Design a protein around this nucleic acid. Structure first.
Ligand SMILES: *OP(=O)(O)OP(=O)(O)OC[C@H]1O[C@@H](n2c[n+](C)c3c(=O)[nH]c(N)nc32)[C@H](O)[C@@H]1O
Ligand SMILES: *OP(=O)(O)OP(=O)(O)OC[C@H]1O[C@@H](n2c[n+](C)c3c(=O)[nH]c(N)nc32)[C@H](O)[C@@H]1O
Ligand SMILES: Nc1ncnc2c1ncn2[C@@H]1O[C@H](CSCC[C@H](N)C(=O)O)[C@@H](O)[C@H]1O
Ligand SMILES: Nc1ncnc2c1ncn2[C@@H]1O[C@H](CSCC[C@H](N)C(=O)O)[C@@H](O)[C@H]1O
Ligand SMILES: [Mg+2]
Ligand SMILES: [Mg+2]
Ligand SMILES: [Zn+2]
Ligand SMILES: [Zn+2]
Ligand SMILES: [Zn+2]
Ligand SMILES: [Zn+2]
Lengths: 293, 126, 293, 126
RNA sequence: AUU
RNA sequence: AUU
């Protein structure tokens, strides 16, 4: 049955370990999957990611705000953005961004280093597929990476609405301890591996329903070691079965309530609604975002 | 050289990029690649340009921006409305023509009454 | 692309070996595949078998004659016969048979031991899924089996039209040396493993375009040893991808010519036509078949 | 006991097996199982009983014989025509009713004009 | 990581 | 072998 899911989530048993960081040794490493004819790798990958997000309690307000970093590619197009625009409810504001120029179906496309992206607005969903190419260079030790991760950790803490969610791509060597720790500031979190790229150490750290405060204490270094151990001991076969039925793919628009934050008004009813995908807390004016340097 | 760089540069250089691409094709050039085909049910309305994939069993749905010559060349659009009809939407391409979606959107027109590709689904005249 | 094919055929490299019979030790032995919701194992298996037969040069005459042994099942229905009826051209005579009573979509259903089946007519396609349950009983050595195989070897030699084809199911322990030897009396032959049951030693011995004389000399014992060696050294992953597109499933009716046999009329042009699925040699009157004992 | 043995024996024993099965169902009995569902494209005409699978996107195609109560009970058919309409063909069952195809073919009737299930595809009256 |  |  596992081959028919969009992917595999890190079991809680493995989150609760205290492993030492090991080198990642996947049994099927580098293997390529055969996809439906003419489908790009990222169309399949993003479709499976969205299929998995469909099973979580994502808040889906009217006039949703979704931002997608790392949306460019060496092909000059943005397959991930096309999948996101297919998935999100009509009228959702979709903004994407990348270091290099590209063509996109998003409402606004921001070119430049993600650190040049400025906005006063808070967001409901943050998707990041960013990856530093120099990560491929051989290094002495697999240490926590800064760069865009730094920016991302700031964004989540400053520009993510309470109740919002994130999916941030990491790999064996492209990871950040503070991002893992921030995962404990959500109502729920996991590391999700799509079945079409199960031969890679790539995963998406998914935080569901942001709470703005530490609900769970997480040591990022230990948690990345736990992720690597889980990947090493639990091989996953490449699979694209979930791509054959798209009838239930669109994100169900639930009209999640949106309200503005007040001074110390987060009572336990508010935490309940936030943790169940029933409330987004942020202002709701027109969005103004730019990467002008 | 990266894929499509030559043809996209050649078309972006001309004053009439559509004519430049059509001439490139008539001389045997390889069509623009990496138009983004989406996964879909193929049980859609079959209309030409839609907000979600609407391919029927005889079409393929593509991300609109990746099938627009002007979008792909990073040049200004000559559309009289002042904006692009494809960017941000999904374009249905007949499966027989899915080898060149950019060429198909350049060479064909949408019926403003029923929304189908004229000559590939529109039956208003007959 | 192997996972997207209906199955895997025994490479010619392995047919030409000279191995001794060993125990079959499949790495994934017994593993179950997840099929499309509500689809029976035999619907999937017979569909893949027919998908593979679609790639061969089967003669498909008007008023085709197909007979299917072992068409019953412990469920009292005949999924394989339903797949064959879907696959074969409309108007094809489909007769099936089994030891135990069952309900079928075939034109005639013959109940009883296959040795009780009598007919003067020759057939264009012979499908056999027969398996003796006592084969499961532990035995000292894996020897060539008689039983229905004996009957089958007679049927192919007496009641199969020139140009006709067969697909006979075998396993590690359910096999017969003479059947392998008869495989050399066809224009082409192979042992085909469906992807949905690749965790089993089951295969279909497929003979394509019967010639009535030995074209290739085959030692049945050695060839079964070769098959087991191939299965042992080339593990196959369970796969049902080919089941997701049925648009080109029906057997293409090409109206293969049918003519009656005469005394010593097999010139090399006739062999040419027979080997390409372009000619069936048999009479073409009304079929009368029975298992009345 | 083998699957369906009890209900098939009970229905075969009655003089009116259709009434016996409908009473069995009305008392909460588990529907007859192992009707043979086929793989198909689900792009068919949607007609009720056809020579090949003709399911549309809202139906499933089954081997006709496995969905016939009289075939499954090994009893004689009361069809006035003297033969079975299901054996040797394929029956399209609405997906909502695919949990009990034998019951569905027992309880429903085919329009002799358009070939659709009356109440599940036939629009001749309206 | 952009199979 | 009738997962
Ligand atoms: O995309 P990746 O899965 O390669 O992760 P990464 O880019 O962070 O890793 C960089 C380099 O590590 C080496 N290597 C990584 N992994 C995960 C494996 C593996 O599983 N098996 C082997 N034999 N090598 C691996 C790669 O050189 C990779 O470029
Ligand atoms: O359907 P099968 O694949 O089991 O073939 P079979 O019925 O002819 O074999 C009978 C018995 O052999 C034993 N056994 C067979 N095979 C192929 C294997 C195998 O691959 N791995 C193991 N560990 N045992 C096997 C079975 O007892 C089987 O019933
Ligand atoms: N600091 C940074 N700021 C912005 N983009 C960055 C970045 N570091 C890496 N990237 C971008 O991360 C991207 C990874 S490739 C991502 C592929 C894309 N998701 C798709 O849909 O195909 C590259 O395009 C790279 O330019
Ligand atoms: N000597 C013999 N004569 C006739 N049938 C035989 C036989 N030996 C075994 N069989 C039959 O071989 C069958 C194997 S089960 C086959 C399943 C069937 N293909 C399906 O579509 O489900 C059993 O039903 C058994 O009764
Ligand atoms: Mg990969
Ligand atoms: Mg099996
Ligand atoms: Zn454009
Ligand atoms: Zn029109
Ligand atoms: Zn009947
Ligand atoms: Zn009608």
């Amino acid at each position: 049955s596992q081959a028919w899911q969009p992917g595999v989530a890190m079991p809680n048993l493995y989150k609760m370990q205290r492993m030492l960081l090991e080198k990642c040794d996947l049994q099927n490493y580098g293997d390529s999957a055969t996809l439906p004819k003419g489908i790009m790798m990222n169309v399949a990958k993003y479709t499976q990611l969205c299929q998995y997000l469909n099973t979580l309690t994502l808040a889906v307000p009217y006039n949703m705000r979704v931002i997608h970093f790392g949306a460019g590619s060496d092909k000059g197009v943005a397959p991930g953005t096309a999948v996101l625009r297919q998935w999100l409810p009509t009228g959702t504001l979709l903004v994407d961004s990348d270091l290099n120029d590209f063509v996109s179906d998003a409402d606004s496309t921001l070119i430049g280093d993600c650190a040049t992206v400025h906005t006063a607005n808070k967001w409901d969903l943050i998707i990041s597929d960013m990856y530093d190419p120099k990560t491929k260079n051989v290094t002495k030790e697999n240490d926590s990476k800064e760069g865009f991760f730094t920016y991302i950790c700031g964004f989540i803490q400053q520009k993510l609405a309470l109740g919002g969610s994130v999916a941030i791509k990491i790999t064996e060597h492209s990871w950040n301890a503070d991002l893992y720790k921030l995962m404990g500031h959500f109502a729920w979190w996991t590391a999700f591996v799509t079945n079409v790229n199960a031969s890679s150490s790539e995963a998406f750290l998914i935080g569901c329903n942001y709470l703005g405060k530490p609900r769970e204490q997480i040591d990022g270094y230990v948690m990345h070691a736990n992720y690597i151990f889980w990947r090493n001991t639990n091989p996953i076969q490449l699979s694209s079965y979930s791509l054959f039925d798209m009838s239930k793919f669109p994100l169900k628009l639930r009209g999640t309530a949106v309200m503005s934050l007040k001074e110390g008004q987060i009572n336990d009813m508010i935490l309940s609604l936030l943790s169940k995908g029933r409330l987004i807390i942020r202002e709701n004016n027109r969005v103004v975002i730019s990467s002008d340097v | 050289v990266p894929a499509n760089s030559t043809v996209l540069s050649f078309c972006a250089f001309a004053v009439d990029a559509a004519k430049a691409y059509k001439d490139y094709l008539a001389s045997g050039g390889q069509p623009i690649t990496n138009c983004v085909k989406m996964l879909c049910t193929h049980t859609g309305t079959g209309q030409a340009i839609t907000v979600t994939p609407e391919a029927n069993m005889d079409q393929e749905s593509f991300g609109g921006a990746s099938c627009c010559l002007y979008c792909r060349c990073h040049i200004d659009h000559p559309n009289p409305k002042g904006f692009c009809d494809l960017k941000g939407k999904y374009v249905q391409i007949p499966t027989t023509c899915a080898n060149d979606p950019v060429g198909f959107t350049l060479k064909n027109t949408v019926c403003t009454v029923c929304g189908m590709w004229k000559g590939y689904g529109c039956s208003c005249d007959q």
